[PDB]
Each structure stands twice: as structure tokens, then as C-alpha cells.
Write a protein that binds this ligand. Structure first.
Ligand code: IXB
Length: 171
């Protein structure tokens, strides 16, 4: 049976208990921690593509007030649909299952300046989601997998000094 498990969940939960933050910039910024998953239950003989997108978590934005994340007003219009294709795609199920699948090269940005980056709105909370797509499937079956341990708020600069120190400590 298809099983997708989050790698280094303990490290993600350290950031989440502080409310995790990810920097977005004009040219795009890579994530820390990096989203990595282990996969089992795929057909090793079949070929698949791994896709990544980011889902909004609330219908409001956030603000850091008195060292505390609080609801910070009505949200901006939803960011456009941005899908990141894992550069190993398409590949055999045996490839995806022999070692954890890392999305280390994806970049988060606040501009639609191309480059295959992910457009996010600052001060909004997002949750990464992974999609698995089989090549050649007339039913075009797709599997979606959410990871609530990896939720974060997009920021142009770190608000929580504990988050700033955490990023330096483990990266
Ligand atoms: N009748 C059908 O359900 C059917 C028939 C042929 C191919 C698929 C397919 O694309 N799968 C199966 C499954 C697999 O390959 O592990 C899978 C995992 C992720 C994404 C797609 C798919 C589904």
C-alpha cells in the first residue's frame, strides 16, 4: 500500500511549536528545513512524477504582536496556483523508493518573476502538499499527501527571534 512518510519530523516539530516561518524574496528563497519524504507502496516498474504545491491554511492573515502570532486581518486574494515539479520527474517507482525524495531546490517568492518558483503572500500561512502522478495513465490517477507538521507563515523577514536562532542552529 502507498505510504508517504515525512522525514525529520522531529526537526519540523521544533519549528512548528515556535510557529514556523519561511522567507520569501523577489528572486526566491529555498526552504529550511527542506521537505523530504520516504515513499513505499509504489510500483517499482512504473514511472511517476512528484509534484509540490502550497495550500493556504486560513481565510485570514497573521501578525506578530507582543512576541505572539495572532490573526492579523482579512487575507489578500489567494496566490496563483504554483506547482513545483521535482527535477527527477519522470522516474521509476524504484527510483523514488530507494532514497528519500528531497525538494531542496524549490524557491519561495513574493513575485511572479518566473523561474518555476512558488508565489506566496507574506504573513499568510501555508501547508506543503505533495502529488504523485503516474505516467501514461488514461485515468490520470493522482495521489495527494498533506504534511501539517510542515506548516509555516510566509514572511519577508523573520518575526520571531527564536525562529531566527533556530534556523542558524540547525542549518
Ligand atoms: N485503474 C486505476 O486505478 C489505474 C490504472 C492504471 C494506472 C493508475 C495510476 O496512475 N496509478 C496507480 C498507482 C500506482 O501506480 O502505484 C498510482 C499512484 C499514484 C498516482 C497514480 C497511480 C491507476
Amino acid at each position: 500500500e502507498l505510504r508517504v512518510g515525512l522525514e525529520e519530523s522531529e526537526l519540523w516539530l521544533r519549528f512548528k511549536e515556535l510557529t514556523n516561518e519561511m522567507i520569501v524574496t523577489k528572486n526566491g528563497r529555498r526552504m529550511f528545513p527542506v521537505l523530504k519524504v520516504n515513499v513505499s507502496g509504489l510500483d517499482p516498474n512504473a514511472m511517476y512524477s512528484f509534484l509540490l504545491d502550497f495550500v493556504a491554511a486560513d481565510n485570514h492573515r497573521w501578525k506578530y504582536v507582543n512576541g505572539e502570532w495572532v490573526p492579523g486581518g482579512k487575507p489578500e486574494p489567494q496566490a496563483p496556483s504554483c506547482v513545483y515539479i521535482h527535477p527527477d520527474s519522470p522516474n521509476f517507482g524504484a527510483h523514488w523508493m530507494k532514497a528519500p525524495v528531497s525538494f531542496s531546490k524549490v524557491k519561495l517568492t513574493n513575485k511572479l518573476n518566473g523561474g518555476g518558483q512558488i508565489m506566496l503572500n507574506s504573513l499568510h500561512k501555508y501547508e506543503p502538499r505533495i502529488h504523485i502522478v503516474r505516467v501514461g495513465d488514461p485515468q490520470r490517477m493522482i495521489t495527494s499527501h498533506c504534511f501539517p507538521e510542515t506548516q509555516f507563515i510566509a514572511v519577508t523577514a523573520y518575526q520571531n527571534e527564536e525562529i531566527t536562532a533556530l534556523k542558524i542552529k540547525y542549518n
